[PDB]
Design a protein around this ligand. Structure first.
Ligand SMILES: NC(=O)C1=CN([C@@H]2O[C@H](COP(=O)(O)OP(=O)(O)OC[C@H]3O[C@@H](n4cnc5c(N)ncnc54)[C@H](OP(=O)(O)O)[C@@H]3O)[C@@H](O)[C@H]2O)C=CC1
Ligand code: SF4
Ligand code: SF4
Ligand code: SF4
Ligand SMILES: [Zn+2]
Lengths: 171, 150, 48, 126, 208, 331, 114, 95, 96
């Protein structure tokens, strides 16, 4: 169940020869030279990308139905499950009486990218999408409104739908 | 003066020397970026521990109220030109600990931030993208042309 | 995608856009809600 | 012995570290919260709540978020009964307004009253 | 009740109750209550003036041998007049067990320190003074360990707000990091998540 | 007034003070301090810059999110000015170089651009205009600086009859060119000066007092159309001022009774007109109101000269106290 | 009403501790000004200490004033050893906050603060 | 079909547009105002109405588990078409 | 694996082990990046009969802690538990 780590003329001469002639130092140098002659694992960014998964948590997006009509139904589960309180929702019924949203703001400098909103959405409207290269220069640009989220959804629908099709049976 | 501006922008952007200023999870993500998988050193990016010989500073982690004078002094000891890259969500807007009593709500209040990198933690490929965006920002600088116009 | 194309939709962008930060096409935040409380406009008729 | 006698009111405003303006100008409220009339459960009206008043909440210049200046705007305290709530309110020097609890009157429900013979309590439909 | 219900152990419950009777009979001067929880964890509630003569017993008796101090915690309950609930967690390696020793104190009542028994408390209760305000008597080096140097007030008290009273920002006017009254860009949205129905029947308090 | 510009909050960082300011030439010294004082009240600031964006980065942490809007503008392009001041309700003018560059002489930095800004602001219906001029602005002066300042303030008063012209006497601060110049000409040699500087009277005024007066003039509706005279609370001879400046620096004083360094490709160290302006006495304006008419506490030099000139001491005298210096002699 | 004392048996001993703390602070104000390169006079710091001592001079409980003496000792130990910064010492002197209104008319003009 | 307020700003689908005297329009100078050009109401308006052969009809939005929860719509009325609560699709009866 | 045989032998000699047997760089031997869809199994209580919730509730079976002694014969000295048994030395790699 347990073991004792570090509990251990020819041998004395071998130790003295290792002292004077540096046997184990030569061994360590040989391993260093072994690692010199291998193929380095540097991938050619940005022309090459690291491996990922269809479950990758990236940029927030708002999806749509396959008829043009938006998916969010103003149920406020995402802002109730959000651990960082980064989601602000204000809702009202529009002209046709459909329960939709008027303000859907995500503070992306508050968001912790944990995917609770993408799993608490009953109609799969909000999705933590796949995009990770969305660094900005100003603080206000990382403060998405509803129009930016809808534009991101219409931008990345062609792969978000495929990722959902690939992953939805594990949920 | 247009071509001399093109020269010194190439010299500064291809030999960026960051400083070893990490604080939290995001520091381990930076160390993962500096691994052989992504290899910051291929871009002319070699870690230097002293603020007096550093070009940029990547603030990784949560900046608390006990840490703001230290970050301010470290930034004030860096020679010009200097750029600050915010990282994660803690150094962006507080992130998870935005409403806490002892967390600065974004490190913009202490130092002027040039490049915002979003994530928690941001992926090392995204961080490389942010550093390349900073390099492209350095490339389009117009110092000597503006000096000639003035 | 040459052998497995994505499904065609009417709202999918026909052209991809790179990161537009630092350009005159960058995103700025704004509220999407109207005026919350209206204001009493005074009448234009003389008070006499 | 190892004990002393102190015959003064407990005032710990100087050790809680709160600023002065949030001591004399804040009116606390000690009350039993009313039941939400949309529901029928009475578990939420079991313990006394000590709260404070509501200060200004203006719109943000960016998106009209609820920007506030009161640090005590989200302070809700729970006490078992009234006397400890009053003692805690007077211990920190907070001037308080106390509302007594409102126990509902025990009604006299009769199922046979809907089927009376010489009374107005005859129901019209069932 | 097999697959989704936690199994119940009764031999450990009986042994912990027997050890609780043993402790409550050996020390009747300070021990007030002994209770064994449903998941087989012993709790001893004693007087504050008997913090030190109890703990050394649990560190030196051959039948207890609780040689490790795992965690030391204070809990703020504003209902009671002794709002601070000091909790010592002890671990015995020879008997492979865990015990909990609980006591109470208010703001102005000092508690005898435990650095003469467990040296780890040399930090632990010190952090308690940084967070709640419980003063510990005869501490060797008592100073704030977690909060800021100029911080006034104890943050872990329940009457202290979530966001503090001061926030820091850099000022070019004085070239200094200064503290200003707190003004949040967005208010912390308080959520009412308590269901108004009776939670558990077995934990029903008697009414007035 | 509109509901978006109604004041709100406790006057903190994230509050709304209802002030939309266009600070022209905010990248400098007074512009930096005015932007810092405006950003702590929570006011919308529009900063148009002529230099590189990086040099404006120090203006970023002084305000909240979106409270400072950086813009591109030209001194000879009125369309950029109209883009800048179309939405502001107060426009502050601080534009001025101490030396003539290759393209911009003194006339087109002191006369043409404030007239253009005033005309554009009057066309856009800007309610409040604040202009900064010089106290010693004389049409019959000995320097081009003061003459062009006089013509510029005359044109500002004529174009905008409701313009608040404010004339600081001599601003000193952390990044100024008045005490710093006096401490920096010790590098040249034995501090050259005309007639030992015993004939000219100078009244320096602290920068924080000027910024507070500008803020109060923005707030007060009774300051429109006036001509304030921001004058410090004390009068010093030039010899005694140099005495005090070298006294707080703990440098030995070896005096003796300018165009050579004005032709450098860098920022010039000194000019001829700077030498003319140093030996120009402060005018006395008892009729015009000062900083005491705006509720501003005037700060004398004795508590701020050490603050300004601490950086010029070596480490031999880096541990001196505030009170261990004999102060200057008043007149 | 019977309480456990900490250090002070009566009010006289607590006042003795208060005087000792004020003596130590008045001693260490010039070294705090000189060492931190504070840009204020010694009189400003000493009268700041006097202002704080007069501000906390409304307490009649021996335990509360004893805890105040202890916390002053913590501040003195954090000042005597260089654990603070320039900003931590300068946080007492509020230099960035504008003067708040105090009369009723000005507060009525500003906002809804009662 | 975006409408243009005569201040120059486009109008979002929520009806928000800054007034001509609003100072906050200065946040849009030198930059652009981002607004979705795919209006949801004008994209669901032209979707045809389906005639079903029963009194009630079940709608899940299509895709099975990829859509909304399944809701049953009654078409007893002969005046208004039964519109889905989630997807906005409307069904009717041929009688 | 795109290296010549002499470099292979030099690496094997200088490291002292067969490096090409266990490479640290991934190749075709790993699982494919796309997979067929699965069919997830069900839990134990997805029945239709004899599955009343009251007979398998976990939260409702929690009891309040039992008070042993409350302040409102020659009993043997007891222990919290039997003493921990002596650990056995590992027969696989005893390091001895
Ligand atoms: N010595 C003093 O401090 C005194 C100053 N004044 C007046 O006070 C005001 C503010 O002073 P101060 O802060 O010290 O001055 P600065 O020289 O420090 O700042 C001048 C500012 O105006 C800009 N600017 C200058 N010329 C032009 C131009 N032709 N076109 C566009 N922008 C221009 C500069 O931009 P950039 O350099 O980035 O191109 C800079 O931001 C000025 O009007 C000055 O004349 C009055 C009395 C004494
Ligand atoms: S991913 Fe998590 S933190 Fe981010 S918005 Fe969704 S729920 Fe909130
Ligand atoms: S959970 Fe989904 S449907 Fe509900 S409010 Fe959020 S995005 Fe809309
Ligand atoms: S942003 Fe997230 S990953 Fe980075 S330090 Fe904060 S909590 Fe950790
Ligand atoms: Zn449907």
């Amino acid at each position: 169940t347990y073991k004792y780590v570090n509990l251990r003329m020819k041998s004395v001469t071998d130790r003295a020869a290792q002292t004077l002639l540096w046997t184990e130092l030569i061994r360590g140098l040989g391993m260093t030279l072994s690692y010199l002659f291998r193929e380095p694992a540097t991938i050619n960014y940005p022309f090459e990308k690291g491996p990922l998964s269809p479950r990758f948590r990236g940029e927030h997006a708002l999806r749509r139905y396959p008829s043009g009509e938006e998916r969010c139904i103003a149920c406020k589960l995402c802002e109730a499950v959000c651990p960082a309180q980064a989601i602000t929702i204000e809702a009202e019924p529009r002209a046709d009486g459909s329960r939709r949203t008027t303000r859907y703001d995500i503070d992306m400098t508050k968001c912790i990218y944990c995917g609770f909103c993408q799993e608490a959405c009953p109609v799969d409207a909000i999705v933590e999408g796949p995009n990770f290269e969305f660094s900005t220069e100003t603080h206000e640009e990382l403060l998405y409104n509803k129009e930016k989220l809808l534009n991101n959804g219409d931008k990345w629908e062609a792969e978000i739908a495929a990722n959902i099709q690939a992953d939805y049976l594990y949920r | 003066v247009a071509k001399l501006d093109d020269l010194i922008n190439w010299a500064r952007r291809s030999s960026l020397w960051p400083m070893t200023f990490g604080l939290a999870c995001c520091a381990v993500e930076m160390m993962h970026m500096a691994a052989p998988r992504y290899d910051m050193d291929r871009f002319g990016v070699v870690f230097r521990a002293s603020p007096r010989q550093s070009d940029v500073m990547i603030v990784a982690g949560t900046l608390t109220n006990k840490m703001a004078p230290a970050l301010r002094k470290v930034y004030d000891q860096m020679p010009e030109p200097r750029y600050v890259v915010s990282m994660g969500s803690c150094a962006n807007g507080g992130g998870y600990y935005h409403y806490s009593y002892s967390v600065v709500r974004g490190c913009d209040r202490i130092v002027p931030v040039d490049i915002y990198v979003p994530g928690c933690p941001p992926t090392a490929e995204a961080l490389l993208y942010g550093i390349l965006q900073l390099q492209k920002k350095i490339k389009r600088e117009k110092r000597l042309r503006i000096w000639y116009r003035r | 995608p040459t052998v497995k194309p994505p499904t065609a939709r009417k709202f999918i962008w026909t052209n991809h856009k790179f990161n537009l930060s630092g350009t005159p096409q960058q995103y700025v935040p704004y509220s999407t809600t109207r005026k919350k409380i209206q204001e009493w406009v005074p009448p234009s008729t003389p008070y006499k | 012995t190892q004990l002393i006698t102190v015959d003064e009111k407990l005032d710990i405003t100087t050790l809680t570290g709160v600023p002065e303006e949030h001591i004399k100008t804040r009116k606390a409220r000690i009350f039993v919260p009313a039941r939400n009339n949309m529901q029928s459960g009475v578990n939420n009206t079991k313990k006394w709540k000590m709260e404070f008043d509501t200060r200004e909440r203006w719109e943000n210049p960016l998106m009209g978020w609820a920007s506030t200046a009161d640090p005590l705007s989200n302070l809700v305290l729970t006490f078992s009964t009234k006397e400890d709530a009053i003692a805690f309110a007077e211990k920190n020097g907070w001037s308080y307004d106390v509302e007594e609890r409102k126990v509902p009157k025990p009604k006299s429900k009769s199922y046979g009253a809907n089927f009376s013979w010489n009374k107005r309590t005859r129901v019209s439909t069932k | 009740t097999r697959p989704t219900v936690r199994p119940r152990n009764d031999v450990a419950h009986k042994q912990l109750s027997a050890f609780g009777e043993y402790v409550a009979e050996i020390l009747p001067k300070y021990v007030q209550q002994v209770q064994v929880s449903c998941f087989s964890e012993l709790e001893i509630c004693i007087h504050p003036d008997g913090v030190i003569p109890v703990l050394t017993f649990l560190r030196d008796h051959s039948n207890a041998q609780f040689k490790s101090l795992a965690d030391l915690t204070a809990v703020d309950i504003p209902t009671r007049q002794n709002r601070f609930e000091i909790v010592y967690n002890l671990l015995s390696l020879r008997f492979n067990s865990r015990i909990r020793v609980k006591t109470y104190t208010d703001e102005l009542t000092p508690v005898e320190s435990s650095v003469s028994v467990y040296k780890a408390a040399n930090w632990y209760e010190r952090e308690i003074w940084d967070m709640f305000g419980v003063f510990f008597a005869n501490h060797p080096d008592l100073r704030r360990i977690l909060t800021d140097y100029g911080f006034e007030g104890h943050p872990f008290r329940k009457d202290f707000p979530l966001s503090g009273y001061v926030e820091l920002r850099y000022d070019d006017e004085v070239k200094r990091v200064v503290a200003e009254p707190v003004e949040l860009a967005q208010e912390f949205r308080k959520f009412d998540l308590n269901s108004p129905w009776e939670a558990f029947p077995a934990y029903r308090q008697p009414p007035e | 007034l509109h509901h978006a510009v109604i004041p709100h909050g406790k006057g903190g960082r994230s509050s709304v003070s209802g002030i939309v300011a266009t600070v022209f030439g905010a990248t400098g010294f007074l512009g930096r301090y005015l932007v810092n004082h405006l950003g702590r009240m929570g006011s919308q600031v529009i900063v148009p810059y002529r230099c590189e964006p990086y040099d404006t980065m120090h203006l970023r942490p002084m305000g909240d999110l979106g409270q400072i809007i950086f813009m591109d503008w030209n001194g000879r392009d009125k369309d950029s000015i109209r883009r800048a001041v179309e939405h502001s309700n107060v426009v502050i003018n601080l534009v001025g170089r101490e030396w003539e560059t290759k393209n911009f002489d003194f006339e087109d930095v002191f006369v043409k651009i404030p007239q253009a800004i005033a005309q554009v602001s009057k066309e856009a219906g800007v309610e409040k205009f604040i202009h900064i001029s010089h106290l010693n602005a004389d049409i019959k002066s000995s320097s081009k600086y003061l003459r062009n300042k006089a013509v510029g303030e005359k044109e500002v008063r004529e174009t905008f009859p409701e313009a608040t012209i404010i004339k600081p006497a001599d601003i000193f601060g952390r990044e100024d060119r008045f005490l710093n110049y006096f401490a920096n000409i010790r590098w040249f040699g034995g501090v050259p000066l005309i007639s030992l500087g015993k004939k000219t009277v100078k009244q320096p005024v602290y920068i924080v007092d000027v910024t507070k007066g500008i803020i109060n003039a923005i707030k007060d509706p009774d300051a429109r159309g006036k001509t304030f005279a921001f004058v410090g609370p004390n009068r010093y001879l030039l010899f005694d001022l140099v005495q005090y400046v070298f006294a707080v620096a703990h440098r030995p004083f070896l005096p003796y009774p300018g165009r050579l360094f004005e032709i450098s490709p860098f920022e010039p160290w000194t000019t001829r007109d700077k030498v003319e302006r140093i030996h120009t006495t402060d005018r006395t304006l008892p009729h015009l109101p000062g900083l005491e008419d705006l509720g501003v506490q005037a700060t004398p030099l004795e508590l701020k000269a050490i603050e300004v000139l601490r950086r010029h001491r070596t480490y031999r005298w880096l541990s001196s106290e505030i009170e261990d210096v004999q102060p200057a002699k008043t007149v | 009403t019977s309480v456990k004392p900490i250090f002070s048996r009566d009010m006289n001993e607590a006042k003795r501790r208060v005087r000792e703390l004020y003596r130590a602070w008045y001693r260490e104000v010039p070294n705090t000004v000189h060492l931190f390169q504070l840009d204020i006079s010694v009189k400003q710091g000493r009268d700041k200490v006097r202002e704080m001592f007069k501000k906390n001079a409304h307490v009649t409980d021996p335990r509360v004033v004893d805890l105040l003496v202890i916390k002053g000792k913590m501040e003195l130990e954090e000042t005597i050893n260089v654990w603070k910064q320039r900003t931590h010492v300068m946080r007492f002197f509020h230099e960035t906050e504008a003067p708040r209104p105090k009369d009723f008319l000005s507060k009525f003009y500003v906002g809804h603060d009662p | 079909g975006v409408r243009t307020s005569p201040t120059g700003e486009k109008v979002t689908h929520t009806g928000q547009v800054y007034d001509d005297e609003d100072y906050r329009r200065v946040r849009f100078v030198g930059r652009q105002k981002e607004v979705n050009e795919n209006f949801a109401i004008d994209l669901i308006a032209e979707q045809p109405v389906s005639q079903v052969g029963s009194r009630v009809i079940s709608c899940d939005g299509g895709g099975g588990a990829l859509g909304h929860p399944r809701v049953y719509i009654n078409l007893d009325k002969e005046t208004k078409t039964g519109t889905c609560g989630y997807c906005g699709l409307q069904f009717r009866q041929q009688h | 694996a795109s290296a010549t045989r002499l470099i292979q032998g030099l690496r094997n000699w200088a490291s002292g082990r067969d490096l090409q047997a266990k490479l640290q760089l991934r190749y075709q031997e790993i699982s494919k990046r796309t997979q067929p869809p699965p069919k997830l199994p069900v839990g134990p209580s997805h029945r239709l009969s004899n599955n009343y919730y009251c007979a398998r509730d976990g939260r409702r079976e929690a009891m309040p802690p039992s008070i042993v002694m409350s302040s409102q014969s020659e009993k043997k000295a007891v222990s919290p538990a039997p003493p921990i048994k002596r650990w056995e030395l590992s027969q696989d790699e005893p390091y001895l």
